[PDB]
Amino acid sequence: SHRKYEAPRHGHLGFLPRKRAASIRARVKAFPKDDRSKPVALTSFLGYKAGMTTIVRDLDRPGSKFHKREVVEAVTVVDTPPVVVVGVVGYVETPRGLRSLTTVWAEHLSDEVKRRFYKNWYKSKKKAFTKYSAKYAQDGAGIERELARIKKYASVVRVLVHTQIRKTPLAQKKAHLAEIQLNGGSISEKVDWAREHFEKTVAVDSVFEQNEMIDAIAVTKGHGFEGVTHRWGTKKLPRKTHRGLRKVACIGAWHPAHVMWSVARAGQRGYHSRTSINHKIYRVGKGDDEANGATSFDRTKKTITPMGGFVHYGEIKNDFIMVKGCIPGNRKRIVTLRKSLYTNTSRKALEEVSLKWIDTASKFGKGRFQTPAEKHAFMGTLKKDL
């Protein structure tokens, strides 16, 4: 009767059931609506969250006290090694949705996807697509037949992309595989983009640009079984309470004479698949630049990687986004950078960047330097020397 002081619900009912996701790789539960007046391009890309660092830049938001002034914002890095296409896929339209028809593949599929489709590589015979692959020994009859059947049907089409994981310093010899839906017009152009890209790689450099908005789809960090307060921020009970205080007191009333779903019980915090949106890109670079840490304003030769290396990862020697701020999942985790489902009219999506400076310093310490050059310039001759 009449909770004395009305206060608001703890936690979000929509993001239930806070259970473990079916896999580390997060599905894409919807895709950008197609504009059949463009070339075919992917609607997403795959990469690995790698960490963060501290970029500095200037603002261009009139209205601000910090207009035209420097700001120390936060950026997360995604290693986006170019991902290779090894299949396409059909989807016909039904009163039950986009039902599949074929999943067609290339020929010389790597050991990586062959590994994905096993669990015990070294003592298996490594025999996955042997016969579908020998079917290329002909002119490619059924290959092109189903290509044609998909040209006919397949109200939707998806290229199948596997990552070039052997690049990144990870010790996972297996490459994550997934679909990416195509949103040009011209179904012929769709499939032929696919086909010309069979066994070919693609990079974000062809899909994303500066000052553009993406969305991040991944799995939450794993925190195990965890209790009610921290899962829902529920108020800790006092010190005087018999039998624990990291609890909830009234888990329900007498009538309805059960316990409702609406109630904060202990359980699993983490390994949830989450979809964060409207994250603006700040820089899209490659492996060659020795001096990404050198910018328009910085010339000191130093790339994006900070001293000593990223923590828990190893070093970026491949393509990369630095995108704004917080992006679900922890380091080493697969991530999908999808692009949006609508236009920003924020002025904030569109306040572009002129980057100025980066910390390239050891996040494994309190780095006070940027280069070993600077390091020696600052201290100098060591009792070790020459």
Binding site: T54, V56, W357, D359, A361, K366, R368, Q370, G380
Partner: protein, 68 residues
């Protein structure tokens, strides 16, 4: 920008990477980290702290630069 210097060590201070401390009158101090901040609060003496700029500049240690 201006790479500030640590008021206790003179080590160099990029943006975000530390703190400012307004003394109660107006005297500013910049700190790279909670380390130098805690030393400052403990009221410790850099000219005796064996390892900062203001230590060796006092001590004529390894400058080897003023006679060039």
């Amino acid at each position: 920008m201006k790479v500030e210097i640590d008021s206790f060590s003179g080590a160099k201070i990029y943006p975000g990477r530390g703190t400012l401390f307004v003394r109660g009158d107006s005297k500013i101090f910049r700190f790279q980290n909670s380390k130098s901040a805690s030393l400052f609060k403990q009221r410790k003496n850099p000219r005796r702290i064996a390892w900062t700029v203001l230590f060796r500049k006092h001590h004529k240690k390894g400058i080897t630069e003023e006679v060039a």
